[PDB]
């Protein structure tokens, strides 16, 4: 019987899978992105080409940007970073959504890039990362897993983590699985980048771009599984997580004030994430079914910042204290899977999804109209905090065996956004055996991304006095736009792969024609009226659809069995293009290439040793400033190629106890954040030098299990 389309397309060229065993061998400090990023066609990248919040790097697929990476936990969406204000340059003061699940309670991670991702609907344009948690088995099992690291250079933050799982039957009909976790990544020190900063003059002399922000994680999760009947299983799950930061002086434009200096080392933002889900699985005569409901409540509490003026994107000393933004996201999903025998062996999947997102953010819509002038249709003051959107979806996929060795997997997805309207995402992926050892695979599909609630909301208004305004130097507004189109991306890949006796050699070409990407507008749509001074009658820009952008590249893989205990794995990504075809500017700043190499030696039954090297290519920043003018000076600075090497091992003391130890970045190659891409008054830009690369870092781990 032929697999589902969902399962079949997990073999597409753009899919990589990281196993629990992979995670144990190459344990991450804390956030899972540290291992996810080492897959081909994946980068660890800032949210925004401006470099703003540049040390908060996140998973970026094929140069599409972090905003286009849809993160799932056991198939269910994570949306929590949407509680954090999305700014003029697509910046978000967010660490991302890859740190909600403790690494040692993960069963596997599916990284799904390109055409095979589009079927996952809204948000899957770059791709999909599905984090799958370990589940209960027949008898009662459990673990306790500990990890600690030790930076060579004390200015770089060390991480400690402890997590435990326990699972197995509860009655005849009933099973549970629970886990919990406590973790701390320290922040880098306030002065880590001193000596490396962009040129700063006048008022801004002495200022510093910050290193990486710290985090404190508390997570717990509980799942109950109930067999009603042979055919029918019902699952209840709740999760509660808290992340509090450790602040080291990051501000939007890398200035300081005393409220910043006062908060160094303290908690300045906290994220609570609550999840509840219920899930029904049935095994039937005609096939199979799956349904679920998930409620995710995210609370983002953080210190007040300004949206313009002297307090833009920095703690506001005259409005001290915190606000809370609240996101409520409800997701419901139903499907059936149908083995059909006559004609071709095939398996039909039919389903739907409904989602609602409610956002309440009392800091985001509080820019008044007093300086730039008033805007018809927009109340200067006391605008509604909340926004919302719903998407209802229908889909059909069929996995069709034409002959042995040939599979065709067409699918169609339909989405109704209750504001933006209808969308169609057609999908085709196929596999073809050329010989017993060589396969050809290819795909093309149209992925879908609805505009985010900030971009869609006419109550969302930003202001500039001049510096931020495209095509001009006088004052403007940027206004949300509820008549936006969705973004779509026609994403294609072609892959050929040789495979025999664990020898694997493969090469894949990919290309995304990215349509109607949403960005801050380039031409005024109107002008405000009144205001104060030369700024009065400000230009009104909207959030607007860019007609065309493109990324293109290659992914390559080579795995050699050098000997029985000894495996040499390599992957290579080469970026051919990443262009916004309206502005001629770069879409997402990624290295030109990434080559990951791993040597894995099973030295004994009980001992395993690993060496790794990663080579990154050149990075080039934005050509143009917010005006559309050619950038000059250090704002043109590029990062050179460099390499990062590691070693580690795992020693199995018994069936119940394992330990790991190693060193990351063994030759201690370090990079320092010098600033954002472009400068502001008194602070030069730093081009591509927007992040810290940590230096040599030792680590130990221990895992007790039964």
Numbering used by the authors: 16 to 721
The authors write:
In Gram-negative bacteria, Fe3+-siderophore complexes are recognised at the bacterial cell surface by highly selective outer-membrane TonB-dependent transporters (TBDTs). These transporters bind the Fe3+-siderophore complex and translocate it into the periplasm. The structures of pyoverdine, pyochelin, citrate and ferrichrome iron complexes bound to their respective transporters FpvA, FptA, FecA and FhuA showed that the ferric-siderophore complexes were bound inside the barrel adjacent to the plug domain, a position thought to be poised for translocation. Pseudomonas aeruginosa, a serious opportunistic pathogen, does not make enterobactin but does possess a TBTD outer-membrane protein PfeA, related to FepA, that binds and translocates Fe3+-enterobactin into the periplasm. PfeA has the same two domains (22-stranded β-barrel and N-terminal plug) common to the TBDTs.
We constructed four mutants R480A, Q482A, G324V and R480A-Q482A (double mutant) to validate the observed recognition site. Each of the mutant proteins was purified as described for the parent protein, and crystal structures of each were obtained. These structures were essentially identical to that of the parent protein, which confirmed that the mutations did not affect the folding of the protein. Neither G324V nor the double mutant were able to form a complex with Fe3+-enterobactin. Unlike the parent protein, the R480A-Q482A double mutant does not coelute with Fe3+-enterobactin. The same titration was carried out with G324V and R480A-Q482A, in both these mutants no binding was detected. A R480A-Q482A double mutant and a more radical G324V mutant have the same structure as the native protein, and did not show any detectable binding to Fe3+-enterobactin (ITC experiments, size-exclusion chromatography and crystallography). Analysis shows that for the double mutant, the lifetime of the Fe3+-enterobactin complex is reduced by four orders of magnitude compared with native (10–3.8 and 100.8 s, respectively) indicating only a transitory interaction. When the double mutant was expressed in bacteria, it was inactive in 55Fe-enterobactin binding and uptake assays. We conclude that the double mutant PfeA is not competent for the uptake of enterobactin in vivo.
